[PDB]
Amino acid sequence: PTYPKYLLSPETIEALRKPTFDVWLWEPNEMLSCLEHMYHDLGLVRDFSINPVTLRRWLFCVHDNYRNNPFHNFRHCFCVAQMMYSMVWLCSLQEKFSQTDILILMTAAICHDLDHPGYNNTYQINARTELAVRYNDISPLENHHCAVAFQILAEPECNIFSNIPPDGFKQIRQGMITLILATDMARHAEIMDSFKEKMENFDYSNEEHMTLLKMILIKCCDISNEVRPMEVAEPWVDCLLEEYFMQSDREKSEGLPVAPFMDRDKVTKATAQIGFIKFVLIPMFETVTKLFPMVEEIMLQPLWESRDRYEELKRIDDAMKELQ
Amino acid sequence: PTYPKYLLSPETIEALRKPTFDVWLWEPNEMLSCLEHMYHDLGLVRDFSINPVTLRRWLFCVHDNYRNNPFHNFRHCFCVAQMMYSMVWLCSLQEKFSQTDILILMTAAICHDLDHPGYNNTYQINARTELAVRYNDISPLENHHCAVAFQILAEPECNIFSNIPPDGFKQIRQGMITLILATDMARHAEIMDSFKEKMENFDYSNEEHMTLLKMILIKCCDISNEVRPMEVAEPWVDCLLEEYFMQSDREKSEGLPVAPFMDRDKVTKATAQIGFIKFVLIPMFETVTKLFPMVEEIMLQPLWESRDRYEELKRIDDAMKELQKK
Numbered sequence A: 001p002t003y004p005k006y007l008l009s010p011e012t013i014e015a016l017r018k019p020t021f022d023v024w025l026w027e028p029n030e031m032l033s034c035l036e037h038m039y040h041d042l043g044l045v046r047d048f049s050i051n052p053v054t055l056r057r058w059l060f061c062v063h064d065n066y067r068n069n070p071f072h073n074f075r076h077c078f079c080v081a082q083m084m085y086s087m088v089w090l091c092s093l094q095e096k097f098s099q100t101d102i103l104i105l106m107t108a109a110i111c112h113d114l115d116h117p118g119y120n121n122t123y124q125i126n127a128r129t130e131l132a133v134r135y136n137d138i139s140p141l142e143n144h145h146c147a148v149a150f151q152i153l154a155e156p157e158c159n160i161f162s163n164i165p166p167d168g169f170k171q172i173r174q175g176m177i178t179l180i181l182a183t184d185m186a187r188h189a190e191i192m193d194s195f196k197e198k199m200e201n202f203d204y205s206n207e208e209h210m211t212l213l214k215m216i217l218i219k220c221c222d223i224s225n226e227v228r229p230m231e232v233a234e235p236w237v238d239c240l241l242e243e244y245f246m247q248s249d250r251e252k253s254e255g256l257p258v259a260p261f262m263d264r265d266k267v268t269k270a271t272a273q274i275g276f277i278k279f280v281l282i283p284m285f286e287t288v289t290k291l292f293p294m295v296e297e298i299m300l301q302p303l304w305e306s307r308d309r310y311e312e313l314k315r316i317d318d319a320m321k322e323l324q
Numbered sequence B: 001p002t003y004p005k006y007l008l009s010p011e012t013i014e015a016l017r018k019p020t021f022d023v024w025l026w027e028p029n030e031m032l033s034c035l036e037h038m039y040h041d042l043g044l045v046r047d048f049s050i051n052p053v054t055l056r057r058w059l060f061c062v063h064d065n066y067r068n069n070p071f072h073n074f075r076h077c078f079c080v081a082q083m084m085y086s087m088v089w090l091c092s093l094q095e096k097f098s099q100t101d102i103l104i105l106m107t108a109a110i111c112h113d114l115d116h117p118g119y120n121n122t123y124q125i126n127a128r129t130e131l132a133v134r135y136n137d138i139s140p141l142e143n144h145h146c147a148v149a150f151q152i153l154a155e156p157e158c159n160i161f162s163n164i165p166p167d168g169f170k171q172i173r174q175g176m177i178t179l180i181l182a183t184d185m186a187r188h189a190e191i192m193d194s195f196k197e198k199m200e201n202f203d204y205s206n207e208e209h210m211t212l213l214k215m216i217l218i219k220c221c222d223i224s225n226e227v228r229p230m231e232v233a234e235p236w237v238d239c240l241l242e243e244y245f246m247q248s249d250r251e252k253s254e255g256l257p258v259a260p261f262m263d264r265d266k267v268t269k270a271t272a273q274i275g276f277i278k279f280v281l282i283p284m285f286e287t288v289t290k291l292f293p294m295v296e297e298i299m300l301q302p303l304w305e306s307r308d309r310y311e312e313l314k315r316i317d318d319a320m321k322e323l324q325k326k
């Protein structure tokens, strides 16, 4: 008659494939099911012999290792993985990548922010936290994310890779590590040039080229909120600042340097996103379009719109601050 | 009168400056004193307001954080540190390096192998160890040595940097982290090339040129046993293979791969050092000699000798196994 929520309706399974899928409409359970479906759907369960029950526990254990942060939480996790999923279709990645690579992109996307503490690397380093000390100031967050990802995959009951020859595990593990560590925005500029370089004459056969592409791909999905529909996109800006301000305050109480872009007294939903969209998002997606031109209409388009919308929104804010 | 051991004689203090020092005669405490003496003698206690007592609690704490592996232990720690000390004099480093770099080189050497487990990075990764998982297969050992180093310095009673301004702290931490991580032999080639490349036209005023020099410097001190006198050097080779075989054993009975150079059946004290001296040691100290010629005679020399000796041993060593085997 009427089936429970964790039984995705054939409509859901259809929307899930596109970047428009409203990420806010579901509860963890439902989202967990979505992720589950993704692995079966991409043939990952099939091509690697992933025990379906294990996939269930793994995802459940993954969801449990994400803190309840305003921004870097389980729903964000979902966003990145779902956006990665979208791009697999939109770009026909299965025509360019081996099922193994696809496994990497997806698993990596899902694990990229495991146990994120709600404070960036700059804070971890200045506050000389355990993460900072443990990782010798080298992308402590990402290094931690990655470690937790594999601590989980080390639990036999969650080891969704239990039936992969050891030679494969090594290749998958390497790839994931690379990708997850590539999400530290500190390395953005560096990664973009490496990619832009090999781009002058891309080569899907060349391995280094492909690793950069996978790197660029996970980065895209990771900060792809602004690509999403304006209603689903805006609320995340609030979550983000909610986190940035939480850190800027703490930094102030503890007398640690405060990044201006996180300063509660200088930031507004507008000024924050305008620079990010114009100078980080657009350019990155721009160069990716060179390889997958259908990305221009599906992701570059909403970005241009959000840029204008936010730019105009500041234009307005300035006029108001003026009257006063 | 007859003073106690922890009281260094002016002879020892004099011997501590040459690479011919018998790193075997001394016991932990005496060695701690030698280390302590180096920090004073180099002007580090002076130029960094190091509380003289903290310096001792720290050395004590560092020592207590080294395992009792046949090779990778506190006495090795002391070797590398004492070698670095020698290098500073022999090469007049106080002329080309700031006291901050001299600080970095010394502290980095003393901490370079902190809490070493006894099994290399290859074992850590393949055995999917807690360390390999923690540092995502990235120089997990060195990364660890480094972390422990700073957790020790995080203790107020062991913090020899407590009187250094925060900016200088950051600067030192950065350098220490770079040098310790640079001791991962897996990077020996990469690092060597960078140095030889910057070596085409070396510039003592170029930060990058100096960073490679320091990396090369600590690497030289780290694997500098064979540079020492035959009787001081040799016993270390045994200690190393004892640790190597221990691993290859564990590896064979855990189904994990085993390196030939660590295989109990294909490695003699000789075959291990002949190749290592000819392809790793000599080459490195050679390029370093371009920068410091006096290095050739005091270190490149005992290496050629060592190389010749081991090659000699290998012959009689081989002949012997031609009486064995049916």
Ligand SMILES: CC(C)Cn1c(=O)n(C)c(=O)c2nc[nH]c21
Residues within 6 Å of the ligand: A185, A223, A240, A261, A272, A273, A276, A280
């Ligand atoms: C400095 C800037 C890149 C910081 N930054 C960021 O890292 N992410 C992920 C954002 O979404 C964002 N939005 C504005 N600034 C941002």
Ligand SMILES: CC(C)Cn1c(=O)n(C)c(=O)c2nc[nH]c21
Residues within 6 Å of the ligand: B185, B222, B223, B224, B225, B240, B272, B273, B276
């Ligand atoms: C990785 C490292 C153990 C290699 N290593 C070393 O450090 N020393 C001092 C040797 O004598 C040696 N001989 C072979 N490999 C060696």
Ligand SMILES: [Mg+2]
Residues within 6 Å of the ligand: A112, A113, A141, A142, A183, A184
């Ligand atoms: Mg991140």
Ligand SMILES: [Mg+2]
Residues within 6 Å of the ligand: B112, B113, B141, B142, B183, B184
């Ligand atoms: Mg080491």
Ligand SMILES: [Zn+2]
Residues within 6 Å of the ligand: A112, A113, A183, A222
């Ligand atoms: Zn993220």
Ligand SMILES: [Zn+2]
Residues within 6 Å of the ligand: B076, B112, B113, B183, B222
């Ligand atoms: Zn060492």
